[PDB]
C-alpha cells in the first residue's frame, strides 16, 4: 500500500493542469501548473472578511490545510512546510520536517493555536502558531489529519489493523488522548477491473482510502465523509466505552430525493463542513465526482437519519414525505443532536453563546415529533407501542399533551399509565 498526500476536500489534477489543494467552509486553495513552477491561489467564501491572494510556489506544495487565521502548506517529499497567516500581524514561517529514507508527509493540519504534521511512518509532530515544537510522538502511520482549536482527529492505517482513528488534545506541555487508535468503521472503496478506463479512477489513485473530507463539526464532534458519500459522526467520544460512529446523512439518498425519486449519475456532493445540522458542500455536476474550475457557490444539505426507504417513498408520490414517516426520522435526528449537544454543553460549555436556546428548541422538536408517532400509535389502537413512546418524552408538559391525545382517542387505560409516568418522575426527583 502506498501512502498518498492527503488534504481535506482536495481534488486531483486528473487530465487538467489545476486542482484544489484543500477546501472547507472558510474557502478553497487551488494550484495551477505554471511553466516549471506553480501558482497557488487562496480564496475565501466571505469576500468581505478576507482578501483573496496568490503567490508563486517554487517547491510544489501538495499538502494544505486552511483555517480562519492562516493557511498551512506542505511538501510531501522534501518535508518543507510553511504557515502563512492571513493577517499581517504575524509573519509567515517555514520549517523542514526531518524525513527518513522513503518517509513522506501524509497530512498536515492547523488551527489558530496549533500546527500538526503527520508522516507515513507515524511520526506526529506538533507546533504552536509560531513554530515552537512540541514533543515528538511515534504512532501508527498517519493517513489523514484534522484539527479544531487544541484538539486533533487523526486517521491511521496499517496492514495489520486496517483503519483506526485517534482523538487527542494538545495541551500546554503534553498530548492527551480521548481515544487512541479505535476502529474506524468507514467503508473503503471497491474498485473493479473495468475501473481502469473509468473517468473517476484518477481520484482513487490520488486518494486510495477514499476519504473525501474529515473535520470537526461546529460543535466539536469529529466527522468523516468517505467514498460511500455518507457523513459519519463520532458520538460519545468523551466516554471511551460509549463512543460510536453515527451515519447522519446518506447524501446519495438526498440527491435521489432532490431529483424527484430518479436515479441520477451526474450529481455529486463534495463535503466542506458540518454546521450543527447542515452539511456545507459543493454540488458537483459532471462526469467527475470532484469539483473543477470555476468553483460553484456552496450549497447546504440538512442531515437526515438513514431511515427512509426508496420504495416506500415512491408510493407516497421533488419527493414529498408523509408526515407520519417524516416524524420517525425527525424524532431520531432530534434525539441524536440533543444527546450530542447536551454532552457538549456539560463538558465544554458554550462557544457561540446561544447553544442553550438551540438545545431548548431541539428538545421541543424532539417531543413534538414523538407526540406525532404517539398519535399514530393511538390511531392504530396500539396501546403498548404508544406507552413506550410516552416513556421517551422529555418535558412533563409533553406528557400532558400525550394525556390529551389519549383522551381524544378514548383510551382511558393509556391515560392512567401515562399519569403513572408523571408520578414516577416526581418520586425520582425527590431522591
Amino acid at each position: 500500500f502506498r501512502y498518498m498526500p492527503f488534504s481535506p476536500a482536495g481534488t486531483p489534477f486528473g487530465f487538467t493542469d489545476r486542482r484544489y489543494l484543500t477546501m472547507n467552509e472558510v474557502g478553497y486553495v487551488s494550484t495551477v501548473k505554471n511553466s516549471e513552477q506553480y501558482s497557488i491561489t487562496v480564496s475565501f467564501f466571505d469576500v468581505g472578511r478576507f482578501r483573496e491572494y496568490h503567490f508563486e510556489d517554487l517547491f510544489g506544495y501538495d499538502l494544505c490545510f486552511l483555517n480562519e487565521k492562516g493557511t498551512l502548506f506542505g511538501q510531501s517529499k522534501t518535508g518543507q512546510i510553511q504557515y502563512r497567516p492571513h493577517d499581517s500581524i504575524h509573519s509567515n514561517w517555514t520549517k523542514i520536517i526531518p524525513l527518513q529514507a522513503g518517509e513522506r508527509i501524509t497530512s498536515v493540519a492547523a488551527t489558530p493555536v496549533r500546527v500538526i504534521v503527520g508522516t507515513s511512518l507515524g511520526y506526529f509532530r506538533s507546533f504552536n502558531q509560531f513554530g515552537v515544537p512540541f514533543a515528538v510522538e511515534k504512532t501508527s502511520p498517519i493517513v489523514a489529519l484534522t484539527a479544531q482549536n487544541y484538539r486533533v482527529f487523526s486517521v491511521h492505517y496499517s496492514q495489520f489493523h486496517g483503519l483506526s482513528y485517534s482523538l487527542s488534545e494538545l495541551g500546554t506541555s503534553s498530548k492527551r488522548y480521548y481515544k487512541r487508535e479505535c476502529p474506524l468503521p468507514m467503508s473503503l472503496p471497491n474498485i473493479n477491473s473495468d475501473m481502469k478506463k473509468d473517468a473517476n479512477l484518477d481520484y482513487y489513485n490520488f486518494n486510495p482510502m477514499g476519504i473525501k473530507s474529515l473535520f470537526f463539526s461546529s460543535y466539536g464532534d469529529p466527522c468523516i465523509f468517505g467514498s460511500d458519500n455518507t457523513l459519519l459522526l463520532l458520538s460519545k467520544w468523551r466516554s471511551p466505552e460509549e463512543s460510536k460512529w453515527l451515519p447522519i446523512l446518506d447524501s446519495n439518498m438526498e440527491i435521489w430525493k432532490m431529483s424527484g425519486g430518479k436515479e441520477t449519475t451526474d450529481i455529486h456532493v463534495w463535503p466542506l463542513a458540518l454546521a450543527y445540522d447542515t452539511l456545507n458542500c459543493i454540488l458537483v455536476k459532471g462526469k467527475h465526482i470532484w469539483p473543477e474550475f470555476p468553483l460553484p457557490l456552496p450549497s447546504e444539505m440538512e442531515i437526515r437519519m438513514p431511515v427512509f426507504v426508496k420504495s416506500k417513498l415512491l408510493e407516497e408520490n421533488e419527493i414529498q414525505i408523509p408526515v407520519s414517516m417524516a416524524a420517525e426520522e425527525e424524532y431520531l435526528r432530534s434525539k441524536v443532536l440533543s444527546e450530542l449537544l447536551t454532552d457538549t454543553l456539560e463538558n465544554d460549555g458554550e462557544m457561540y453563546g446561544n447553544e442553550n436556546e438551540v438545545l431548548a428548541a431541539l428538545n421541543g422538536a424532539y417531543d413534538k415529533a414523538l407526540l406525532r408517532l404517539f398519535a399514530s400509535a393511538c390511531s392504530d389502537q396500539n396501546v403498548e407501542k404508544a406507552l413506550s413512546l410516552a416513556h421517551e418524552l422529555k418535558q412533563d408538559r409533553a406528557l400532558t399533551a400525550a394525556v390529551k391525545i389519549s383522551e381524544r382517542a378514548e383510551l382511558p387505560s393509556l391515560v392512567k399509565k401515562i399519569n403513572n409516568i408523571r408520578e414516577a418522575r416526581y418520586e425520582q426527583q425527590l431522591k
Binding site: 421541543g364 407526540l371 391525545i405 381524544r408
Partner: peptide
Amino acid sequence: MDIXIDDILXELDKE
C-alpha cells in the same frame, strides 16, 4: 381514525 393533535401541539409551544 385520524386524531387532531395540531391544537395540542400549539398549546405546547406557548409558555
